[PDB]
Ligand binder design. Structure first.
Ligand code: F0Q
Length: 165
């Protein structure tokens, strides 16, 4: 009946920065939304708490969710190491969009990105499953620690995360 909301509390070299919350589009991409919800709560015994944003390209996006290898080579879903592209209904319409990173068709795990620009070239090959609800300003503050090749100048972490309400 109503889409779930999750939060990240972000820190920069261990110092609190602020809270980002996300609406998850369970009404359109239930399986993909549920994966991200569950990794956010930690209810399977693993998830996003303590993981880093390993690649931030200002004017493009912030990428994270690699809680196994910390560098963009890892992660897993709650269904198995990988799961399918659920659908490509939703498009990358502008800043704030939450979408799955991948390495080929039907290779989703835990890695995700938050768009800081419209990224229409990703439509139809990356599954869009949510958007930033509050704290887009905190995403903009994070983005400033990225660089052209994505390497971050300070360590950007999910200090805490879970489900709101
Ligand atoms: C060097 N490196 N840093 N991170 C990665 C991770 N990665 C591959 C990958 C994704 C998900 C799983 N489960 C396993 C692997 C990746 O960034 N794939 C591309 C991708 O998903 N995206 C989404 C937005 C940014 C990035 C991208 C997509 C398309 C063009 C450029 C770029 Br950069 N690899």
């Amino acid at each position: 009946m109503v889409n779930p909301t999750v939060f990240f509390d972000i820190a920069v070299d261990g110092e609190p920065l602020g809270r980002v919350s996300f609406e998850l589009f369970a009404d359109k991409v239930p399986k993909t939304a549920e994966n991200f919800r569950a990794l956010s709560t930690g209810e399977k015994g693993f998830g996003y708490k303590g993981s880093c944003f390993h690649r931030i390209i200002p004017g493009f996006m912030c990428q994270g969710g690699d809680f196994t290898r910390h560098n963009g080579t890892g992660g897993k879903s709650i269904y198995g190491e990988k799961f399918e592209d659920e659908n490509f209904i939703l498009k990358h319409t502008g800043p704030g969009i939450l979408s799955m990173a991948n390495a080929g068709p039907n290779t989703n795990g835990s890695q995700f990105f938050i768009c800081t620009a419209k990224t229409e070239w990703l439509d139809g090959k990356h599954v869009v499953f949510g958007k930033v609800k509050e704290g887009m300003n905190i995403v903009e503050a994070m983005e400033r620690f990225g660089s052209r090749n994505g390497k971050t100048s300070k360590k950007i972490t999910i200090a805490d995360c879970g489900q709101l309400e």
